């Protein structure tokens, strides 16, 4: 039991800090942990942040400090996505969003990063994660943020490769009527597998164009939406949008 | 549960009282209960306290089931030990003296952590030469004894080391050659008979095939360490002859049971390599040998990733 | 949660939102919030994060969307000595979704097959 | 145990009742004896 | 007008505390 | 519903040894036997109903010739009887001749001897024929009123599984407890009486132990025990009412009995997961585990750390 | 086995937004322990009910 531990101990219960920075460099690199969690407890969070040598600790310290700089390095050093977590939600209560980005990606928060990339509009960060999404088969973010942006081809693409010929199928009829033949064939070899009376029972419209009545017109629609809406608006004229329930764009 | 696990870390050294009690499946759960507690914060108490245990089972000779929760204890320290190589320092040196025991169980589990142990951590492999060779006298079964030979084989590299193997394999065979000693012995020209005698007039063969690998690597290793030829072809010579002499032992009358023809083919082999000590046969004995056992042990530790991920999976 | 998503491809936008709806009285807020991005409804987003507590995230898409009233009254609940107000993107793009062309009222048109030799001939 | 600034330490976990005979500061020993008269030491 | 020690019940008004200062 | 399917309360493994009696031989002795004979007799026609045997024709000499005995042994195995006989027809209808034993219930539920009154209400804890009960609730109200604790408290489980089986003969049976657990003085019947109210009115039993939960420190361990089962059901059930509680559970940690320090370590547990409150939990089961020198309790209550330990 | 596939549907949890003392509602624990012990517990993963 080190005099040097206990000196520093009753120092800092006397509130005589003059002593207690005496005291500290002759304890050894070992004890200062020790010495750390007991200044945490007495509240004094940052003498203990300065003084543990324990990166667990100075991390924890540093987080409850709201030390970023200090936090990161050692959530890096330490590379667990436990701690990547809690450095994201502390610099999301900062205001640090490119700090939360970095560490949001990390830890591997798919939700996280959406979330804050819906709220500061930075298209480009949802597209970034939309594609590292599909990669790392979170199917749901891509898809979501595929779907954000308007790339309805990788929407159905994306439904296409997981085996979701239905969905897609559903998806390119009201979306991408363009698409809805290709759709149908790799739905009905998919289905003929399975049931091959009701493969042939689906309708394709490249064949049975009577049974798709107001596809031809949303071809047409279809070309105007990408020419009129190739531009993402500014977010700022949110107001100003109509809602999409209120919008009839084959009337339009 | 992940979030009360940490509350029932700071409890470890609480739930090592347990141990008090002497029934094994008690001691079995709580050790392992233990084990997986472990923690940077806690295992040093833990292994200070595992091993005051472990000394405390050397004094009390008196309960049946004294030698199974030292077995235990034993393999709770190497699980610790991994896990924590800091800690593998001062728990090896305790732990080498159970070579020594006549419990093959509990000294076989040492043995295997010894070998582990030695390949992972270099800073380690001097402290376990010097102890295993401080032991090696001291060792009673002949399993215990050959995979001592094999670590004292492998991992010697220094030249007063690998001299130091030679002499207490010169002492454990007793006069050399053994079949006029014996001979001479009966002519008057358990009696303490050095351990490896013991065991090759028993007829143990497979000690001495395991004695001749052993020999040739540090034979070879010698070679390679001294410049001069003169005791170069001295120190292999010698090996040559405690081959021989073990060989003229296992065709003679004198062990209960005679030399096997494997281990025969086998020190033969030894004898010839020594003989032509051709580079291709030194690259062999000295780094695919090692490079085997490495291969080996991280192909288990693959597995039981592989195992431990496809629960997780 | 299916529903939603069989209301969205078929393009029944009506039936959805009465799904937002029923997300919000089984209070589940993660449903209810996966609604409103379906329905493109900016200020049911805005008003989930403000009963969620995530007021940083509210006032964010708030003013981002030029919900000004909003923007304001959340503005009046930060601390202005210890929060900061997060800078708003002016470059920042609406993510509406994409409008229905041809909302699937109908189920999907099957060929009269040839009733089975069998089921032609048992029914009669 | 020792008490320090409202903290209670524990120093050893002793296995029988032992009695405090006294602390030299120059071999930072603590001494302790039993009902037996053996005298232990902690550091 | 002897100093008092020991009130009734403060352990548990101790573990109560405890607990109110955990978020309980 | 055949005697595989049935409820079966007790059972008895006997090697029959001698010839089995005969139906005849059996009708003889409880016919004309002497109160031995008798008694014998009907222990044979127990055990074979037991084992499966159909005796149908014994019923109305049993009625008869045992029913009107005044035999204290001899009633008490009337009530094992008439736990396990057929009292119905295949078809579900009450037997005719079951009216017959009706009178024999409730001239035994007003008998001067305590204890077969007492083990009357027992018994009619394991009817389930309405029918046979309804005739009988004045004498089994009666009964509650009764000198001797030891019908008290067999009369409150009797009215408690009347309730739970038919409430619609004793719809008032939660308030007339209730009136009851006040004013009795006895802890079984207390005992008795506020379990009836946890599974039939939690309420009324809370309301209950709002009266006395200062007091529940200085309670019989029985009582204490039912209340804390009372206190985990209920705040089980509404997470709100925990706050309410934790302070009285906390006082049942220091009780004198170990089983309901246990009960309450267990309780308090799933009232606060503050780790204030799973520290004075863990501590009385590692306390429980030390003081108690019994290895089932201590593996148990070492059962009890590890499920804590997987949170 | 625990790891169940998140879908597009189920729930978000905002870990921000929930109160730190949500013990998760276990079953009663008693009563399932008397059903089973009676016999009466259908064992949950086996028999569909519906089979």
């Given at each position: 039991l080190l005099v040097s531990v206990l000196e520093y101990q009753t120092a800092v219960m006397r509130r005589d800090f003059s002593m207690a920075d005496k005291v500290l460099p002759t304890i050894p690199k070992e004890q200062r942990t020790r010495v750390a969690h007991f200044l945490e407890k007495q509240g004094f969070k940052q003498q203990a942040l300065t003084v543990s040598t324990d990166p667990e600790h100075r991390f924890e310290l540093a987080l409850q400090l709201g030390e970023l700089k200090i936090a990161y390095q050692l959530a890096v050093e330490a590379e667990s996505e436990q701690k990547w977590k809690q450095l994201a939600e502390l610099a999301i209560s900062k205001c640090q969003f490119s700090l939360a980005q970095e560490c949001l990606h990390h830890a591997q928060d798919y939700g996280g990063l959406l979330l804050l990339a819906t709220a500061s509009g930075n298209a480009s960060m949802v597209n970034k994660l939309a594609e590292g999404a599909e990669r790392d088969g979170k199917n749901n973010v891509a898809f979501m943020s595929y779907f954000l942006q308007g790339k309805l081809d990788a929407c159905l693409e994306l439904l296409i490769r997981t085996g979701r010929l239905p969905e897609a199928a559903f998806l390119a009829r009201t979306y991408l009527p363009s698409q809805v033949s290709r759709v149908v064939k790799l739905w009905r070899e998919n289905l003929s597998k399975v049931n091959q009376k009701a493969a042939e029972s689906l309708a394709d419209p490249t064949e049975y164009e009577n049974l798709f009545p107001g596809l031809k017109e949303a071809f047409v629609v279809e070309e105007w939406v990408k020419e009129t809406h190739a531009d993402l608006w500014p977010a700022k004229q949110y107001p100003l949008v109509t809602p999409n329930e209120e919008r009839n764009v084959m009337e339009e | 549960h992940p979030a009360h696990e940490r509350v029932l870390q700071d409890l470890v050294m609480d739930i090592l009282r347990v141990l008090s009690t002497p029934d094994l499946e008690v001691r079995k759960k709580t050790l392992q209960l233990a084990l997986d507690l472990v923690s940077s914060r806690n295992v040093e108490e833990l292994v200070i306290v595992l091993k005051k245990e472990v000394i405390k089972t050397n004094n009390v000779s008196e309960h049946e089931d004294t030698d199974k929760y030292r077995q235990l204890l034993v393999r709770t320290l190497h699980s610790c030990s991994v896990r924590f190589p800091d800690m593998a320092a001062n728990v090896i040196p305790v732990l080498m003296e159970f070579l020594s025991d006549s419990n093959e169980a509990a000294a076989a589990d040492v043995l295997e952590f010894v070998r582990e142990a030695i390949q992972r951590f270099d800073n380690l492999r001097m402290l376990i030469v010097e102890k295993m060779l401080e032991v090696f006298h001291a060792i009673k079964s002949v399993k215990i004894y050959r995979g001592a030979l094999w670590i004292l084989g492998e991992y010697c590299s220094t030249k007063e080391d690998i001299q130091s193997v030679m002499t207490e394999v010169r002492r454990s065979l007793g006069e050399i050659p053994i079949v006029e000693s014996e001979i001479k012995k009966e002519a008057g020209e358990e009696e303490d008979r050095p351990p490896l005698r013991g065991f090759l007039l028993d007829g143990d063969f497979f000690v001495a095939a395991s004695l001749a690998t052993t020999l040739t690597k540090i034979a070879l290793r010698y070679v390679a360490l001294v410049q001069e030829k003169k005791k170069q072809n001295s120190f292999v010579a010698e090996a040559m002859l405690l081959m021989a002499t073990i060989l003229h032992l296992g065709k003679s009358?004198?062990?209960?049971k005679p030399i096997t023809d494997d281990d025969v083919d086998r020190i033969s082999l030894c004898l010839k390599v020594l003989s032509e000590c051709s580079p291709l046969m030194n690259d062999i004995f000295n780094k695919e040998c090692r490079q085997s056992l490495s291969q080996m042990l991280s192909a288990k530790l693959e597995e039981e990733k592989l195992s431990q991920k496809k629960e997780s999976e | 949660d299916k529903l939603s998503f069989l209301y969205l491809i078929t393009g029944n936008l009506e039936k959805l939102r009465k799904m937002m709806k029923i997300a919000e009285i089984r209070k589940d807020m993660s449903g209810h919030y996966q609604n409103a991005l379906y329905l493109g409804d900016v200020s049911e987003r805005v008003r989930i994060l403000k009963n969620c507590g995530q007021k940083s995230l509210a006032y964010l898409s708030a003013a981002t969307h030029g919900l000004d009233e909003e923007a304001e009254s959340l503005k009046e609940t930060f601390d202005p000595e210890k929060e900061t107000i997060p800078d708003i993107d002016p470059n920042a793009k609406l993510l509406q979704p994409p409008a229905p062309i041809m909302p699937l009222d109908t189920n999907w048109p099957l060929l009269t097959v040839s009733k089975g030799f069998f089921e032609g001939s048992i029914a009669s | 145990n020792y008490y320090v600034g409202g903290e209670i330490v524990t120093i050893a976990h002793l296995d029988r009742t032992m009695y405090l005979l006294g602390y030299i500061p120059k071999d930072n020993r603590l001494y302790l004896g039993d009902k037996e008269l053996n005298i232990v030491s902690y550091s | 007008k002897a100093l008092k020690l020991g009130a009734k019940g403060k352990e548990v008004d101790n573990f109560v505390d405890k607990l109110k200062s955990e978020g309980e | 519903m055949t005697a595989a399917e049935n409820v079966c309360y007790t059972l008895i493994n006997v090697?029959?040894?001698?010839?089995?009696?005969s139906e005849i031989s059996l009708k003889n002795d409880l016919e004309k036997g002497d109160v031995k004979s008798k008694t014998e007799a009907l222990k044979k026609v127990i055990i074979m109903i037991l084992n499966?045997?159909?005796?149908?024709?014994?019923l109305m000499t049993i009625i008869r010739f045992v029913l009107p005995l005044q035999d204290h042994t001899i009633k008490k195995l009337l009530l094992v009887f008439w736990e396990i006989v057929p009292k119905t027809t295949p078809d579900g209808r009450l037997l005719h001749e079951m009216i017959l034993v009706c009178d024999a219930y409730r001239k035994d539920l007003q008998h001067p001897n305590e204890f077969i009154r007492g083990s009357t209400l027992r018994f009619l804890c394991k009817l389930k024929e309405a029918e046979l009960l309804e005739p009988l609730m004045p004498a089994i109200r009666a009964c509650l009123e009764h000198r001797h604790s030891y019908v008290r408290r067999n009369a409150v489980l009797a009215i408690y599984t009347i309730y739970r089986n038919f409430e619609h003969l004793i719809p008032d049976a939660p308030e007339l407890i209730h009136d009851f657990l006040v004013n009795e003085k006895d802890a079984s019947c207390k005992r008795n009486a506020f379990m009836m109210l946890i599974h039939a009115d939690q309420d009324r039993a809370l309301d209950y132990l709002s009266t006395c939960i200062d007091q529940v420190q200085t309670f019989g361990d029985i009582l204490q025990l039912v209340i804390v089962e009372l206190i985990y059901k209920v705040c089980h059930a509404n997470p709100s009412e925990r706050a309410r509680f934790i302070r009285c559970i906390y006082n049942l940690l220091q009780s004198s009995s170990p089983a309901v320090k246990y009960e309450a370590a267990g309780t308090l547990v799933t009232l606060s997961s503050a780790p204030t409150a799973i520290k004075a939990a863990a501590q009385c089961y590692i306390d429980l585990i030390i003081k108690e020198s019994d290895n089932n309790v201590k593996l148990i209550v070492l059962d009890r750390l590890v499920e804590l330990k997987e949170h | 086995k625990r790891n169940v596939t998140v879908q597009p549907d189920d729930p978000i949890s905002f870990m921000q937004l929930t109160?730190?003392?949500?013990?998760?509602?276990?079953?009663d624990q008693f009563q399932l322990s008397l059903l089973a012990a009676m016999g009466n517990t259908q064992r949950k993963e086996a028999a569909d009910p519906l089979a």
């Open positions: - | 009358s004198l062990p209960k | - | - | - | 090697p029959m040894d001698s010839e089995p009696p499966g045997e159909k005796l149908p024709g014994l | 109160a730190k003392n949500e013990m998760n509602c276990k079953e």
